[PDB]
Every structure is written in structure tokens, then in C-alpha cells.
Design an enzyme around this catalytic site. Structure first.
Site, PDB file in Angstrom:
ATOM      1  N   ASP A   1       0.731  -1.272   0.000  1.00  0.00           N
ATOM      2  CA  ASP A   1       0.000   0.000   0.000  1.00  0.00           C
ATOM      3  C   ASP A   1       0.769   1.337   0.000  1.00  0.00           C
ATOM      4  O   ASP A   1       1.233   1.809   1.044  1.00  0.00           O
ATOM      5  CB  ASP A   1      -0.979  -0.065   1.187  1.00  0.00           C
ATOM      6  CG  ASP A   1      -1.826   1.174   1.333  1.00  0.00           C
ATOM      7  OD1 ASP A   1      -2.306   1.702   0.318  1.00  0.00           O
ATOM      8  OD2 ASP A   1      -2.043   1.616   2.481  1.00  0.00           O
TER       9      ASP A   1
ATOM     10  N   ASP B   1      -2.552   5.526  -5.395  1.00  0.00           N
ATOM     11  CA  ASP B   1      -2.603   4.571  -4.288  1.00  0.00           C
ATOM     12  C   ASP B   1      -2.924   3.129  -4.660  1.00  0.00           C
ATOM     13  O   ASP B   1      -4.074   2.782  -4.938  1.00  0.00           O
ATOM     14  CB  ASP B   1      -3.600   5.097  -3.243  1.00  0.00           C
ATOM     15  CG  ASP B   1      -3.874   4.112  -2.128  1.00  0.00           C
ATOM     16  OD1 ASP B   1      -2.992   3.291  -1.808  1.00  0.00           O
ATOM     17  OD2 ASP B   1      -4.980   4.176  -1.555  1.00  0.00           O
TER      18      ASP B   1
END
Lengths: 6, 329
Positions: free
Chosen positions: B34, B214
Site C-alpha cells: 500500500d 494509491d
């Protein structure tokens, strides 16, 4: 859905 | 070959996982890599929450390089919350290792039903120091400061289910992954990998919008108002009170997202943000888009964007590299 930080 | 490469696998052809270990003894774990968070956590042997039943667990006692801490911690995400405490041990990413401070989660009740519904064990943040909790220097940065890698930058080449595997390359860029030239966009802040681009869909535009690249987000996040204006004359059906938007996959009115800067232009046409939902109805698709309002009008460019575009995350140059991903390797 999914949404990853604060 | 010259840099660290972690193989990536898709999850339900939307998200993707990668593996990495903790402790002097391997101890593998499946992570969600992430770029939207800056902390690393793993399920602990000390976990008591139901969601940990199917996960690989970390056992410090069985690791000689373990260093205790104990300071309770609460990791917060848009999608959930996970609890535990701080610890430090050897983290092995790809084929490089380093003493790293991470979180040992013992309570995952605030991350349901996602956690139990998924097959990843923990999350490995790849953002910036300031986004972290407990002042932790990013893994790639630390690795660079320790001459383990040439440059403090990582690369993402998302995998396509029944087509090819993916890679998280640390240290250097490889042309094998992208096609055409790379274009760099400077970050507007050293928090998330957030850049500034004009958001143009139809005749609707939002200039100098905040765009966060992201890998931890499964969809495309769009500010509420922007989304509404966007779905006006289209023929999309939003099921009442649900972020569920359905359309005929062949709907000729579906627009193409266009993000621009004076350096380049990035587009995301229907085929990239539509999800077949054939089981629901023949020739049916869902938008895989979400309305999400932040303090500053923000667009979250998640997996859907990264699936089309090979991305470079440069810590040293504080910028993001974007290039068209290769269809196949």
C-alpha cells in the site's frame, strides 16, 4: 471498495 | 535482475498481493503493498480476534533478531482499523533485509468484513515518513541509506489475472515493464504520493486537483459533486443508497477520464474502470468508482489506473513516474 491511511 | 523484484498476484482481478517475511527465521506473510499508507503490520500469534483464524501469524519468541517495544498502536485506514503494539525485527523484502519497526496486530475486529473476506495477512505501507504513525522512515528510504539499493525508488507493474504476474521492483527502473516514454510529475506534498493534475471527464473539469496514486485502493475515487455531474445524462443506474453503479458494458455514453499536466496527459477509458457483473445480468457492468470527499478536492487513482499505467515512485526526486504498461512481458 477498499481504500487504504487516515 | 540488478534490483529487488517481488512477484505480485492478483486478488479477484482487482487488487493484488505480494509476499515478504519477518524475523531472522523466514516467517512468510501475504501483504497488500500500500503506497497509500506508511506503516507495516502483521497478525500476531497473540491475536485473539476471529479474523486471524485464516491468517499466517508472527511469533517473536521464535526469532533471534526480535526486539521488543510494546507501545500500543492503532492503525487507521479509510476502510478500517487494526490494533496492536510496536515491535522490531528483520523484515525481508524480495531478497533484501533490514531491521524494521512494525506493528504486531492482535485485534482486527475493526477491519471486518474486509479482513476475513480477503486472503492477505497484513499491510506493507510504501508512503512517506509523515504519513506514518510512530515516525518510521520508509523501507525503500532506509534501504537506500544503507547502500542496499542504488536509488530510493520503487516500481509497480500490476498483474493481470490470466495474463501475467506483476512486480514490485525496488531500487531501479526496468524498461521491460513499460512502453513509450516515462513522464514525471512532482509531488505537491511528501505525505501520500500525491500530485497535481487537471481532472477532465466530459465537459466537466476540475483543475489543479489533488491526485493520489494509491495501490492500496481498489477503485477510482472521485469527489462527490464531480461524480454526480458526471453521471447526469449517462445511462447509469445507482441503486438507491448504495455506491453501486450499473450500466450496459456497451453503453456508448461512457466517458474517458483525462488527467493532464504541462508534462503529459493520462487517460482512463471505460475498459479500465468497468467491471463485468455478468452474473447479475447479461452484458452488465459496474463503474468501480466511488464518491469520496476530502478537505481538498481529491481524486484517488487506484489499482484501475495503475493497471493501465506502469508507475515509478521516486523518493529522492520527490516525484511520480508514469508510462504506459506493457500488455505482456
Amino acid at each position: 471498495x477498499v481504500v487504504x491511511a487516515x | 535482475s540488478s534490483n529487488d523484484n517481488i512477484e505480485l498476484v492478483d486478488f479477484q482481478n482487482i487488487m493484488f498481493y505480494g509476499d515478504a517475511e519477518v524475523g531472522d527465521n523466514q516467517q512468510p506473510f501475504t501483504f497488500i503493498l500500500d503506497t497509500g499508507s506508511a506503516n507495516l503490520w502483521v497478525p500476531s500469534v497473540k491475536c485473539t480476534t476471529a479474523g486471524c483464524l485464516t491468517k499466517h501469524l508472527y511469533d517473536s519468541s521464535k526469532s533471534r533478531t526480535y526486539e521488543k517495544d510494546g507501545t500500543k498502536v492503532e492503525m487507521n485506514y479509510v476502510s478500517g482499523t487494526v490494533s496492536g503494539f510496536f515491535s522490531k525485527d528483520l523484515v525481508t523484502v524480495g531478497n533484501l533485509s533490514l531491521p524494521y519497526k512494525f506493528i504486531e496486530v492482535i485485534d482486527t475486529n475493526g477491519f471486518e468484513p474486509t479482513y476475513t473476506a480477503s486472503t492477505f495477512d497484513g499491510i506493507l505501507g510504501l508512503g512517506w515518513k509523515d504519513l506514518s504513525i510512530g515516525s518510521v522512515d520508509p523501507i525503500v528510504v532506509e534501504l537506500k541509506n544503507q547502500n542496499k539499493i542504488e536509488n530510493a525508488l520503487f516500481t509497480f507493474y500490476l498483474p493481470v489475472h490470466d495474463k501475467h504476474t506483476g512486480f514490485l521492483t525496488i531500487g531501479g527502473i526496468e524498461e521491460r515493464f513499460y512502453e513509450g516514454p516515462l513522464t514525471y510529475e512532482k509531488l505537491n506534498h511528501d505525505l501520500y504520493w500525491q500530485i497535481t493534475l487537471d481532472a477532465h471527464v466530459g465537459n466537466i473539469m476540475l483543475e489543479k486537483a489533488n491526485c493520489i496514486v494509491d495501490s492500496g485502493t481498489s477503485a477510482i475515487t472521485v469527489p462527490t459533486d464531480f461524480l454526480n455531474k458526471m453521471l447526469q445524462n449517462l445511462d447509469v443506474i445507482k441503486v438507491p443508497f448504495l455506491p453501486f453503479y450499473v450500466t450496459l458494458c456497451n453503453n456508448s455514453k461512457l466517458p474517458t477520464f483525462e488527467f493532464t499536466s504541462e508534462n503529459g496527459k493520462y487517460t482512463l477509458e471505460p475498459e479500465y474502470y468497468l467491471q463485468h457483473i455478468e452474473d447479475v445480468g447479461p452484458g452488465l457492468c459496474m463503474l468501480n468508482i466511488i464518491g469520496l470527499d476530502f478537505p481538498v478536492p481529491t481524486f484517488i487513482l487506484g489499482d484501475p489506473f495503475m493497471r493501465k499505467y506502469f508507475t515509478v515512485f521516486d523518493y529522492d526526486n520527490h516525484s511520480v513516474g508514469i508510462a504506459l504498461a506493457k500488455k505482456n512481458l
